[PDB]
Design a protein around this ligand. Sequence first.
Ligand SMILES: Nc1ncnc2c1ncn2[C@@H]1O[C@H](COP(=O)(O)OP(=O)(O)O)[C@@H](O)[C@H]1O
Ligand SMILES: Nc1ncnc2c1ncn2[C@@H]1O[C@H](COP(=O)(O)OP(=O)(O)O)[C@@H](O)[C@H]1O
Ligand SMILES: NCCC[C@H](N)C(=O)O
Ligand SMILES: NCCC[C@H](N)C(=O)O
Ligand SMILES: [Cl-]
Ligand SMILES: [Cl-]
Ligand SMILES: [Cl-]
Ligand SMILES: [K+]
Ligand SMILES: [K+]
Ligand SMILES: [K+]
Ligand SMILES: [K+]
Ligand SMILES: [Mn+2]
Ligand SMILES: [Mn+2]
Lengths: 343, 343
Amino acid sequence: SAMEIVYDEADLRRYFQTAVLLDHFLDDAVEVDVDAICDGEMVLIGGIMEHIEQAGVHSGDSACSLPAYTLSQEIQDVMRQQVQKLAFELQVRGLMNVQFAVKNNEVYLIEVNPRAARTVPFVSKATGVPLAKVAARVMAGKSLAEQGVTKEVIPPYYSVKEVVLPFNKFPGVDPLLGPEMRSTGEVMGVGRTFAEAFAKAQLGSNSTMKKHGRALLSVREGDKERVVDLAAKLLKQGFELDATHGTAIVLGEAGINPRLVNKVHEGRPHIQDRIKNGEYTYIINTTSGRRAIEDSRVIRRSALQYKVHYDTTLNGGFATAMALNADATEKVISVQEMHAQIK
Amino acid sequence: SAMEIVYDEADLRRYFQTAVLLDHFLDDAVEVDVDAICDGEMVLIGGIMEHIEQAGVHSGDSACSLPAYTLSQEIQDVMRQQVQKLAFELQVRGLMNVQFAVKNNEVYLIEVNPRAARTVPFVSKATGVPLAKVAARVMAGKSLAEQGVTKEVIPPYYSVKEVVLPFNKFPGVDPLLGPEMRSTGEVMGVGRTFAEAFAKAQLGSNSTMKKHGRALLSVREGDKERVVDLAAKLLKQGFELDATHGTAIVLGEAGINPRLVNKVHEGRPHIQDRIKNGEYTYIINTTSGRRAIEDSRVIRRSALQYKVHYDTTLNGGFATAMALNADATEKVISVQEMHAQIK
Ligand SMILES: Nc1ncnc2c1ncn2[C@@H]1O[C@H](COP(=O)(O)OP(=O)(O)O)[C@@H](O)[C@H]1O
Ligand SMILES: Nc1ncnc2c1ncn2[C@@H]1O[C@H](COP(=O)(O)OP(=O)(O)O)[C@@H](O)[C@H]1O
Ligand SMILES: NCCC[C@H](N)C(=O)O
Ligand SMILES: NCCC[C@H](N)C(=O)O
Ligand SMILES: [Cl-]
Ligand SMILES: [Cl-]
Ligand SMILES: [Cl-]
Ligand SMILES: [K+]
Ligand SMILES: [K+]
Ligand SMILES: [K+]
Ligand SMILES: [K+]
Ligand SMILES: [Mn+2]
Ligand SMILES: [Mn+2]
């Protein structure tokens, strides 16, 4: 009345110790951000952003795309409808932001921020519409209608925003994502395709990701299934794979034989070693659970330490994969050209 | 003054509880049997048989070859000489049998049986010399020279002896080889090459071995080195592989990436499951240590229950591998013919 996610009774207390609003955690859910302007008369949708990282990974630290790269129009429209309702009910006059979660083709409302959100600039840039100015006019007494800004702009190119985290400034921290924001800045990637935009945002954020080498895959239960496909993509891109017992087990059941690696406590060599010897060019590590987390800490610290690009979400992993297809230095475009393409 | 191999002090005691002579166990040594006859004037080497399974697996349960398939002539000549020395010293008059163990190019005596041994019949069949008839004559007073049997016979073909175990009659028993004899009988395989004899011997032993499929590998520490080769030989022959945790680690480091399989405690699916489901056509499982044994019991028992061919020794598995290169149904030969090839 710090945020944590508890999985069970034990966990619950367990947290209590070290310790109030309880909410059901919408697992394996897509997170969405919407910025919109309302003038009491109507509502203009500034932008619908679909996060790369799932709900549970703070929006502030999620990568995102404008326009959505996976959500259905249908569903977006739902969200678009909801905002409007919210707008009016709350009697918004100026900017507003709404965050949703999409679970099983269902739309859940996370929060409503009836002010300017840190997303505004990215949206303005992507769409060519200075939402801030507009909403400012709106607040002063000049309607959207009167402003001649009434129709929702859908760019012809992909705009992906990625973030930068201060982890390297505090080595003692576990460089891992969560419900609480820790990033200091963001970059924007502009592309013809999501993969392209993403590759640029990724490169822009200072990533050491390579297009070749050996990948380390160590994912959680709930991801043990999808990883299969990500592993495939990596193989296709020419990566050689290593895998921790559990995950290896799963891949193999699908036709994928990675090179099994040892957790720290299981033998030498182990991960830390390999990481340390620059055996990997990529690491995909997903964890769920206070302990498992604590138990996988070393993987992340080492990786951060060794300059190995790594992802801590599967959705994050896929985007990285997809981006392997694109070439961030292939084509550059200016903000001006960008806006020029808008109809 | 029921035998057992103890690895350490703890073990020692450990045994002591459950339970005397004490003999250093000659690890990774080749076991050899030698059948000879002495008439007080000379000594006749009937045959030198090299065991496939190493010392520690009772000669009565080991497969063997006449002539040896790996021992050097040098070293066989050393055994030959010791046999003669022993024959004379002990005053043998008739048949005798000598058991040696070879380690690091050194011959060790395991025991002397001053009488007809169970290998006699096989040796006679393989060499065309009826040792029992000869030794009987000697015993009755007709010397080896008088008889015209004074030169060792080394047949032009390989003769392999394989055994049959009654484990299927006692499901409650762990179908594992060791220092105590459990076999009820034996067969013989005759071939142009070791591979061919072995193959015939194995088929004859009612082995369900197949020339294709998926193999399961789960070997002890010591075997971790030679396994790679086995794994490779299996790969060449067109098999697919599965392996448990440690084995997998080793294979990975060698470049072989088998499909990982779960130890029963590890989870699902595990070995029993797979064995039970017909996933395997061959199983190679080695174990050292009373406790390590008791644990792995389940692999061995399922293998047997399900009729999957299984080897419990690395030597054995190699032999099985060699046999993949042969066709036990290709050529047959009568004993008359075999004998007729002897010069
Ligand atoms: N019920 C929930 N299910 C899933 N994720 C949630 C839930 N509540 C919050 N989150 C996640 O936590 C973040 C923080 O929640 P929010 O109410 O937006 O906090 P803040 O005021 O810090 O922005 C969101 O960006 C989202 O990823
Ligand atoms: N010191 C030893 N090192 C290795 N193997 C040995 C040793 N002593 C005996 N063995 C193993 O035990 C078996 C039985 O020993 P042996 O003295 O021949 O017993 P038995 O009287 O039953 O024939 C051998 O065939 C061999 O595999
Ligand atoms: N947008 C958050 C940064 C992603 C980071 N590579 C991670 O996967 O943890
Ligand atoms: N030579 C004795 C039989 C061998 C059996 N396949 C085993 O390896 O245990
Ligand atoms: Cl905000
Ligand atoms: Cl005997
Ligand atoms: Cl029984
Ligand atoms: K998110
Ligand atoms: K808030
Ligand atoms: K033996
Ligand atoms: K004996
Ligand atoms: Mn929020
Ligand atoms: Mn013996």
